[PDB]
Amino acid sequence: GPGSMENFQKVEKIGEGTYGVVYKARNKLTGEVVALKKIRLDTETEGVPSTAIREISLLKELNHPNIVKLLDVIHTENKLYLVFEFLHQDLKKFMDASALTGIPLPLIKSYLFQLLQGLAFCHSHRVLHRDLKPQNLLINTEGAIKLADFGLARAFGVPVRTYTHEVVTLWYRAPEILLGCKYYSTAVDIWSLGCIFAEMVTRRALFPGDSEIDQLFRIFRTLGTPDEVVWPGVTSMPDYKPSFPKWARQDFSKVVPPLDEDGRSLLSQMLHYDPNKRISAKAALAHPFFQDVTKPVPHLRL
Amino acid sequence: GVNEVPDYHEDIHTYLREMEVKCKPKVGYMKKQPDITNSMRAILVDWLVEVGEEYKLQNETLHLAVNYIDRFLSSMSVLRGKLQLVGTAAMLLASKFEEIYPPEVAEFVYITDDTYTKKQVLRMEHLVLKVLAFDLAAPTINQFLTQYFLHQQPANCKVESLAMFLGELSLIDADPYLKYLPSVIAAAAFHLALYTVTGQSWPESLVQKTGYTLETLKPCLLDLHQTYLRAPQHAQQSIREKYKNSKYHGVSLLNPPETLNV
Ligand SMILES: O=C(O)Cn1ccc(Br)cc1=O
Numbered sequence: 001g002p003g004s005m006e007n008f009q010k011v012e013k014i015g016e017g018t019y020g021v022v023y024k025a026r027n028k029l030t031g032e033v034v035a036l037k038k039i040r041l042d043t044e045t046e047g048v049p050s051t052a053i054r055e056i057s058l059l060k061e062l063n064h065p066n067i068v069k070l071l072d073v074i075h076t077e078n079k080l081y082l083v084f085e086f087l088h089q090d091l092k093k094f095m096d097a098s099a100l101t102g103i104p105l106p107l108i109k110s111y112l113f114q115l116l117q118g119l120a121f122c123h124s125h126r127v128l129h130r131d132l133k134p135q136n137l138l139i140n141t142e143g144a145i146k147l148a149d150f151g152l153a154r155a156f157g158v159p160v161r162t163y164t165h166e167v168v169t170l171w172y173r174a175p176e177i178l179l180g181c182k183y184y185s186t187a188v189d190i191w192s193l194g195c196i197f198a199e200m201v202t203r204r205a206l207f208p209g210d211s212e213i214d215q216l217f218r219i220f221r222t223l224g225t226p227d228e229v230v231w232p233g234v235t236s237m238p239d240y241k242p243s244f245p246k247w248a249r250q251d252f253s254k255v256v257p258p259l260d261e262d263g264r265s266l267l268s269q270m271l272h273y274d275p276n277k278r279i280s281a282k283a284a285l286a287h288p289f290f291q292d293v294t295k296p297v298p299h300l301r302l
Numbered sequence: 303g304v305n306e307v308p309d310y311h312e313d314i315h316t317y318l319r320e321m322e323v324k325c326k327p328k329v330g331y332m333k334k335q336p337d338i339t340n341s342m343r344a345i346l347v348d349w350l351v352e353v354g355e356e357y358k359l360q361n362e363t364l365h366l367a368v369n370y371i372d373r374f375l376s377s378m379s380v381l382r383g384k385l386q387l388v389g390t391a392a393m394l395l396a397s398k399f400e401e402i403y404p405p406e407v408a409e410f411v412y413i414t415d416d417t418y419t420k421k422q423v424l425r426m427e428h429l430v431l432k433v434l435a436f437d438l439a440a441p442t443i444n445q446f447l448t449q450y451f452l453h454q455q456p457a458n459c460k461v462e463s464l465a466m467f468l469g470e471l472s473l474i475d476a477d478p479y480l481k482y483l484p485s486v487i488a489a490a491a492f493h494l495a496l497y498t499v500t501g502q503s504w505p506e507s508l509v510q511k512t513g514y515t516l517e518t519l520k521p522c523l524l525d526l527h528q529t530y531l532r533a534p535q536h537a538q539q540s541i542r543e544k545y546k547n548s549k550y551h552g553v554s555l556l557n558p559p560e561t562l563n564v
């Protein structure tokens with residue numbers, strides 16, 4: 001790319017991943033505020049990590065207003081700098097600091113509609129995210145919200161083949177992953193967004209489990225223990241046990257009480273057991289829940 | 303259902319069609335390589351077929367690595383003593399992209415029989431990333447094959463394996479296959495496979511999806527049929543060995559048809 005480190009002035013640290021540090025920086029020539037992710041190619045006898053190779057290859061291709069833009073990659077022999085569009089906050093920090101009495105319903109609806117746009121675009125370009133959670137959703141001052149953190153993402157074939165099972169932060173992880181299924185698909189991202197939608201209403205995780213089996217149990221206790229009727233094949237799945245307690249499905253009115261009829265409908269469709277019946281991002285955009293969202297479409301970045 | 307992404311398969315197909323064009327190697331770069339030939343390339347790819355089986359790698363990884371090699375050799379001149387090093391790095395990169403469990407860099411060094419150092423593999427890794435500008439999510443023959451497979455009435459595993467086999471044979475021979483896009487070779491491979499196993503031809507539904515006809519596929523199809531007929535005579539045999547395995551339904555043992563009637 002056309003960038004050199006000399007042209008950026010570091011401003012402060014803003015994060016640290018298991019693969020380096022992010023600084024807020026300023027482009028001294030254009031004025032652009034950016035986020036610089038440092039990926040030490042050293043401190044590693046295996047060369048460029050796979051997380052970085054997928055993040056760059058995939059993000060180079062994904063230009064959408066609700067996907068954080070990769071602006072540049074500065075490739076020293078020693079270090080690797082990913083230059084990203086900068087957004088001031090994440091959805092987790094907003095809910096924990098300013099959304100204490102709650103995120104108002106117009107804003108929730110705007111955010112969800114944007115997340116769906118971003119996600120539909122990923123899926124349309126054969127990219128699974130595989131780590132949708134509030135910490136990985138950046139918000140700016142203009143009220144845009146954008147999928148970020150593509151270091152767990154993956155380019156899929158059609159139909160999909162078996163991919164990595166250690167995927168998705170637990171609280172956001174789809175039942176088909178938890179039950180050890182051979183194949184998973186776009187429906188795992190939709191689940192995570194389901195979890196997130198609910199979380200934005202209540203400001204607390206829907207399924208905060210402390211192990212795989214506890215996670216499943218919390219899901220079952222809310223949505224009912226799935227059987228062949230609701231989810232054909234479920235009982236043949238590798239980590240499905242006959243011994244699973246059989247809990248009853250609870251009315252979604254009791255799962256997220258403040259939510260209206262349209263909301264409850266969309267939510268149930270995102271959290272459908274059968275990944276085959278779970279709504280797609282593309283379909284979800286036309287759900288009546290979004291009828292009165294009028295926030296102008298964010299513009300894509302250069 | 304969702305595993306075949308009903309709501310996205312067309313979007314994806316269309317996108318892979320656009321991308322296979324951007325990721326396409328220069329058809330005539332071998333003449334511009336002073337010191338390497340199609341034959342040397344064939345030897346490298348055949349070796350990468352053996353490395354893929356030794357490490358139980360995905361076939362996709364194999365196709366990606368070939369794509370990287372061909373794009374690299376399109377802008378960078380390489381001495382014959384270094385071609386293997388390019389190939390090794392290509393395979394490393396593709397493994398890191400495509401595999402759940404990529405082999406460690408040390409194993410990539412080990413399969414070169416200490417021709418090259420770990421430092422040389424890693425430095426070449428960097429060079430290849432530079433040259434390709436990290437543009438690694440390339441459409442492969444396989445990405446098209448698996449989609450075309452959804453058009454079998456009904457699914458036949460020998461058809462699928464045979465199509466995979468033919469596709470892989472095409473990686474070996476820069477002439478003529480450098481001149482055909484992944485999507486077209488896959489079309490040819492699928493029709494040949496279908497004709498060979500069941501007597502059937504390229505389905506109309508795939509004419510609708512792809513805009514390709516037996517008309518448009520004909521040139522490639524004639525080349526593929528020849529490659530199939532001469533496969534037992536080729537200098538490079540690693541793919542036929544591989545496809546004897548039950549994993550792939552021993553499809554390399556099927557007899558090619560003598561004529562296509564096309
Ligand atoms: O490359 C360096 O000197 C390290 N570095 C580079 C850029 C920024 Br911003 C911070 C920083 O510590």
Ligand SMILES: O=C(O)Cn1ccc(Br)cc1=O
Binds near residue numbers: 015085
């Ligand atoms: O989220 C990423 O992948 C990297 N990144 C990009 C933008 C910002 Br702000 C923070 C950050 O960590």
Ligand SMILES: O=C(O)Cn1ccc(Br)cc1=O
Binds near residue numbers: 253254
């Ligand atoms: O009482 C109802 O109509 C259903 N119901 C039950 C319990 C809760 Br909390 C909310 C709610 O709507």
Ligand SMILES: O=C(O)Cn1ccc(Br)cc1=O
Binds near residue numbers: 346349
């Ligand atoms: O060892 C040889 O004969 C040379 N050589 C080494 C490695 C590869 Br791959 C091809 C080749 O011709």
Ligand SMILES: O=C(O)Cn1ccc(Br)cc1=O
Binds near residue numbers: 342385
């Ligand atoms: O080492 C060489 O010069 C010979 N050689 C080695 C490796 C490969 Br691949 C091809 C080839 O001709």
